[PDB]
Amino acid sequence: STPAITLENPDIKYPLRLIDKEVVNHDTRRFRFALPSPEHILGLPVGQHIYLSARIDGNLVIRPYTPVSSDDDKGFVDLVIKVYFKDTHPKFPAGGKMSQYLESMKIGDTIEFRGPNGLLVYQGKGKFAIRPDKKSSPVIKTVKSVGMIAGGTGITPMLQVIRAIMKDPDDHTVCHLLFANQTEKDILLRPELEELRNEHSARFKLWYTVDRAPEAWDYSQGFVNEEMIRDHLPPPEEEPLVLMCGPPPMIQYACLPNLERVGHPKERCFAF
Ligand SMILES: Cc1cc2nc3c(=O)[nH]c(=O)nc-3n(C[C@H](O)[C@H](O)[C@H](O)COP(=O)(O)OP(=O)(O)OC[C@H]3O[C@@H](n4cnc5c(N)ncnc54)[C@H](O)[C@@H]3O)c2cc1C
Numbered sequence: 288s289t290p291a292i293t294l295e296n297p298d299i300k301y302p303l304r305l306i307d308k309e310v311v312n313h314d315t316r317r318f319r320f321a322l323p324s325p326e327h328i329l330g331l332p333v334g335q336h337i338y339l340s341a342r343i344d345g346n347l348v349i350r351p352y353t354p355v356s357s358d359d360d361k362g363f364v365d366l367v368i369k370v371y372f373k374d375t376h377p378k379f380p381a382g383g384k385m386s387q388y389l390e391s392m393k394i395g396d397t398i399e400f401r402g403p404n405g406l407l408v409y410q411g412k413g414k415f416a417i418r419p420d421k422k423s424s425p426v427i428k429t430v431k432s433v434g435m436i437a438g439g440t441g442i443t444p445m446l447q448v449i450r451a452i453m454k455d456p457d458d459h460t461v462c463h464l465l466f467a468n469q470t471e472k473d474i475l476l477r478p479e480l481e482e483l484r485n486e487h488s489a490r491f492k493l494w495y496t497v498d499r500a501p502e503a504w505d506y507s508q509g510f511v512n513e514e515m516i517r518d519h520l521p522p523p524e525e526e527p528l529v530l531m532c533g534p535p536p537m538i539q540y541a542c543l544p545n546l547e548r549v550g551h552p553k554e555r556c557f558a559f
Pocket of ligand 1 (some may be wrong): 336351353366369370371375379384532540559
């Protein structure tokens with residue numbers, strides 16, 4: 288049989304109860320929410336995400352999240368969240384709306400989930416189904432490798448795909464991740480990524496860049512650039528799929544221009 292799914296209809300909101308909050312580090316949390324029963328699964332295809340919605344200080348706020356759990360997990364969904372506190376970053380004095388609201392929640396409070404959403408679904412063994420828009424059928428494309436460029440919170444769409452590939456021992460797709468962050472301290476999910484590298488180095492290539500580097504730093508410094516794409520993503524000759532998720536200026540200035548300079552078809556580079 289198959290487990291009951293939570294996300295039965297994408298236009299329904301499902302209020303899920305907060306059951307655990309882990310303080311990962313000063314500004315990182317893992318939130319665990321109960322599904323409708325211990326035997327349910329979320330029902331989130333690999334490649335897709337959920338939305339959280341809430342009334343935050345009187346206004347509707349909707350944001351996308353990719354869980355760090357999977358449909359293998361029965362009874363709960365886990366979200367890893369970077370909390371953007373007010374009065375930290377000079378360009379963002381108010382901090383982040385949904386992430387601070389999540390940080391405010393008490394155990395037992397609910398928040399609305401919806402999904403699945405997104406134009407890309409991973410069908411396994413290198414095959415991706417990518418719709419040009421929601422109203423259109425997917426282009427099925429099968430690749431031997433996947434370049435991945437994540438910035439900041441944009442890691443979780445990548446991690447979800449990486450994990451789905453690595454857990455299939457007969458999936459020979461090679462993932463190459465280039466992961467950008469403000470600082471070393473701000474990197475999400477480093478232990479998790481490094482466990483995957485330890486176990487799956489033949490299929491999983493990992494590299495970091497940071498806007499500013501610590502004194503002891505083994506990786507790159509600066510924004511994603513042409514050299515980093517040449518050195519840390521599959522070459523365009525191999526026709527990889529290129530996936531991206533990060534802040535709009537990162538995609539616009541750092542990623543697309545440099546993917547083009549290396550020769551990847553810019554129009555085929557997919558942004559989550
Ligand atoms: C497919 C997808 C999956 C995602 N999955 C996740 C996930 O698993 N986990 C997750 O945490 N987010 C994830 N995000 C990001 C998420 O959607 C939100 O952008 C994030 O939670 C911030 O929203 P907010 O309402 O708190 O901030 P907003 O109010 O929307 O603030 C706007 C922007 O201001 C910047 N900002 C505000 N305060 C600061 C500060 N103190 N320092 C630096 N920058 C700051 C951030 O870039 C922020 O995104 C995902 C995004 C996408 C597209």
